[PDB]
Structure 1
Amino acid sequence: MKPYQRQFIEFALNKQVLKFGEFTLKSGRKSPYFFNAGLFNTGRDLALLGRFYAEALVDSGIEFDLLFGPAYKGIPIATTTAVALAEHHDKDLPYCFNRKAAGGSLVGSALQGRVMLVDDVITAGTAIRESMEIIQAHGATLAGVLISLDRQERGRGEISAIQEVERDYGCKVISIITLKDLIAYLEEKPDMAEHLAAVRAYREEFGV
C-alpha cells in the first residue's frame, strides 16, 4: 500500500462512494461492497479525484502521449487528471474525448500516438471495446487503461475483466486501489472486522 492509496480509500469512504453492505452487482452476485465513482459530484471531489489519478499515473511509469476520456463518464475525469498532471507534476498533455452522436467526432487534441485511456471502473469488459474502436480507428495505439478500482473477481470464466482487457487489447491496465489494498486497509481498522470477515469471505468465492 502506497500513501495516496491510503487517502484514496479514505477519500472514497467519507464520500460514501465506497460503501459496505449488501449489494447485488450487475452480474447478479451479491457483493459486500460497492464502489460508485458517480458520488464525486463537486469541485473538490473532482479536484482531489484527479490528484489521485495523476499519481497512479505518474507512480506507474507507463508512457503515453495523450489522455482519453470515454463517452460521458470519462470527460470529467480525463479533464481533472489533465489538470492535476499539469499543476502538480508539470506534465502537459493533450486531452481529448469522443462525441457520442448520431460519430468519432473527437473533442480536443489529435487522437495521434499513444493514448492513455482513463475511466472509473470496468466491470463488463465494456465501452473500451467502443472506446478502443475509435483509438484504433484513427491510427493511434493504446498504451493503457487507468481506473479507480480493480474489484479483482471472476467474470464468466476463470479470469477477470481487467485480465480480459489486458488479454484482448495487448494493453496494460493500471489502477488506484485493488481489492487487496481494500482488505489490507480493513486489517488496520479493527472495528471494520465485520466488513473484513465479509470481504475476506467474498474474495475467497470469487477472488481471482
Structure 2
Amino acid sequence: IMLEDYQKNFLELAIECQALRFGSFKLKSGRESPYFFNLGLFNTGKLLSNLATAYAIAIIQSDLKFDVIFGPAYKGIPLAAIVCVKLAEIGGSKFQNIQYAFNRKEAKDGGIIVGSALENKRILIIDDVMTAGTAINEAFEIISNAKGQVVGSIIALDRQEVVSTDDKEGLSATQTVSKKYGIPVLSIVSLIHIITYLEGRITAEEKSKIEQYLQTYGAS
C-alpha cells in the first residue's frame, strides 16, 4: 500500500536505465507480460552501487540471520560480492564479518566453492531472478555437499505470478521454492510494488489493464 524509499528509488532507476520496460511482451510460456525486466542493464558503477544498496536494505529489513552470502555462477558472482560489501558499509557492526562465496562451473588444479569452508555456516543465496528453480536447486546441492545450511534466498524482482494457471494451490516460483526448501525468498520488489509506483504516472485505462493482469496470473 506504500513503498519504502529504497524500493521507489530502485524502480525509478530500473525504468531510467531500461532494466524495467513497459509494453507487450511474451514469456517462454507464450504468456503475455505487460513488462520486461533485465537486471543486467544495471551496468555502470553508479547503477551497481544503487543495486547493491537496494539488495542490502532488503536483507537488513528482513532480519534474516546468516553468515555467508552465496552467488550462483555466473550472474550471482558479482551480486554476492557487491552486496556483501554494501552490507558491511551500511549495516553496522553485525554485518562486518559476513563472508561471500560462489561456485566454479568446473573444478581445476581442486575446488568448486571459492571462499571459506561452508561447513556449519548459515547461507543466504543471492541471484538476479528465479523461474523454474534450477539455479536454486543446483546451489542447494553444492551447498549441502559442503555441509552449509541455506537459510534464505534473495532476488531482485519477484514476478508474483502463478507458475501454472491450472494449478489450484496457485503457487508462484518464489513460493514453490520457499515450500520445497522451507526458506524465505526475499526480493527487492514484487509486481505489487511496480503497480503501486505507477499510480499517478499512467492513465486510468492503463491502471485497469495491469490490475486485471494480476487477476488472471497473480499468485495466491
**Pairing of 1:16-31 with structure 2 (within 5 A):** 16-31=18-33
In structure 2, C-alpha distance between the alignment counterparts of 1:179 and 1:147, rounded to whole Å? 13
Q: Determine the structure 1 residue equivalent to 2:145.
A: 137
TM-score of the superposed pair, with normalisation by structure 2: 0.89
**Pairing of 1:107-126 with structure 2 (within 5 A):** 107-112=114-119, 113-126=121-134
Secondary structure of 1:34 counterpart: strand
In structure 2, C-alpha distance between the alignment counterparts of 1:85 and 1:65, rounded to whole Å? 12
Tell me the matched-pair count: 207
**Pairing of 1:118-197 with structure 2 (within 5 A):** 118-156=126-164, 157=167, 158-189=170-201, 191=202, 193=204, 195-197=206-208
Q: 2:214 aligns with which of 178, 197, 203?
A: 203
Q: Residue 56 of structure 1: CA displacement?
A: 0.2
In structure 1, C-alpha distance between the alignment counterparts of 2:38 and 2:209, rounded to whole Å? 19
Q: Contact 1:98–1:106 at 8 Å: present in 2 too?
A: yes
Q: 1:11 aligns with which of 10, 13, 17?
A: 13
Q: Determine the structure 2 residue equivalent to 1:42.
A: 44
Q: Contact 2:102–2:115 at 8 Å: present in 1 too?
A: yes
**Counterpart residue type for residue 29 of structure 1:** R
Cα distance change, pair 84–192 in 1 and its aligned pair in 2 (3 A): farther
Q: Residue 192 of structure 1: CA displacement?
A: 5.2
Q: Residue 193 of structure 1: CA displacement?
A: 4.6
Q: Residue 195 of structure 1: CA displacement?
A: 4.4
**Pairing of 1:47-126 with structure 2 (within 5 A):** 47-90=49-92, 91-92=95-96, 93-101=98-106, 105-112=112-119, 113-126=121-134
Structure 2: runs of 5 or more not aligned = none
**Counterpart residue type for residue 182 of structure 1:** I
Q: Contact 1:50–1:80 at 8 Å: present in 2 too?
A: yes
Q: Contact 1:46–1:76 at 8 Å: present in 2 too?
A: no
- RMSD value, Cα: 1.6
TM-score of the superposed pair, with normalisation by structure 1: 0.94
In structure 2, C-alpha distance between the alignment counterparts of 1:85 and 1:166, rounded to whole Å? 24
In structure 2, C-alpha distance between the alignment counterparts of 1:29 and 1:57, rounded to whole Å? 31
Cα distance change, pair 42–195 in 1 and its aligned pair in 2 (3 A): farther
Q: Residue 27 of structure 1: CA displacement?
A: 2.2
Secondary structure of 1:127 counterpart: helix
Q: Contact 2:54–2:188 at 8 Å: present in 1 too?
A: yes
Q: Residue 87 of structure 1: CA displacement?
A: 1.7
Rg larger in structure:
2
Structure 1: runs of 5 or more not aligned = none
Q: Contact 1:186–1:192 at 8 Å: present in 2 too?
A: no
Q: Residue 184 of structure 1: CA displacement?
A: 1.1
Q: Residue 136 of structure 1: CA displacement?
A: 1.2
Q: Contact 1:96–1:108 at 8 Å: present in 2 too?
A: yes
Cα distance change, pair 194–108 in 1 and its aligned pair in 2 (3 A): farther
Secondary structure of 2:25 counterpart: coil
Secondary structure of 1:204 counterpart: helix
